[PDB]
Amino acid sequence: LSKFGGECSLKHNTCTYLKGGKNHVVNCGSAANKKCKSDRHHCEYDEHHKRVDCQTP
Numbered sequence: 001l002s003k004f005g006g007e008c009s010l011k012h013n014t015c016t017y018l019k020g021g022k023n024h025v026v027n028c029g030s031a032a033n034k035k036c037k038s039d040r041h042h043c044e045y046d047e048h049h050k051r052v053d054c055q056t057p
Contacts, residue, residue: 001047008036008043008054015043015054028054 004024006017013028013036026045028036029052036043036054043054 003046007040010039
């Protein structure tokens with residue numbers, strides 16, 4: 001189980017992370033502290049507890 005880093009889309013509210021040649025897209029969530037707030041902001045997806053965060057510094 002790993003964490004993956006990517007970048008978020010402000011328009012689409014998604015985190016896109018690259019893994020083994022595949023871009024995986026996950027919705028950031030709509031909570032105020034989870035949604036993408038700045039285009040191409042760093043985001044992370046953690047397979048431990050399926051956590052997505054689009055506000056991670």
